[PDB]
Design a protein around this ligand. Sequence first.
Ligand SMILES: NCCc1ccc(O)c(I)c1
Length: 113
Amino acid sequence: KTHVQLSLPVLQVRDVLVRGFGDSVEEVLSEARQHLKDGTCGLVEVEKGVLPQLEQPYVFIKRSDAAPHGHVMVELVAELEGIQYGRSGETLGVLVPHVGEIPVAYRKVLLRK
Ligand SMILES: NCCc1ccc(O)c(I)c1
C-alpha cells in the first residue's frame, strides 16, 4: 500500500532516551521508515526549546494534504544544518526511536510509504 495507518506514541522530549535516528539525511529517513514499519517510532511535538534537545539530522512528519478515518496524511522531511530534504506541509512533530518511554498521547497518521 502507498499509505499505512499508524498510531504514534507522543513522547515528552526529556523522556526520550535515543534522541535521533543517525548521522546523515539518508540514514535518518531510512531508520525512521524501518522504525515506523516495526512499531518502534515515537513522535515529539515541536515547541520552543525542543529541537536543541534532539540530535540532527532531524526527521519531521509534515501534513501532505487536508484526513481519512481521523488519520492526518503525512510524509517524512529530514533537516540538517537548516536545509530540508523534501517539501511538505505543517510539522506534526519530530520522529525519534521508541524504546518503551511512556507516552502522553497517541497521534493517528496515514503515512505516505
Ligand atoms: N511495504 C512495507 C510495509 C510497512 C508497514 C507499516 C509501515 O508503517 C511502513 I513505513 C511500511
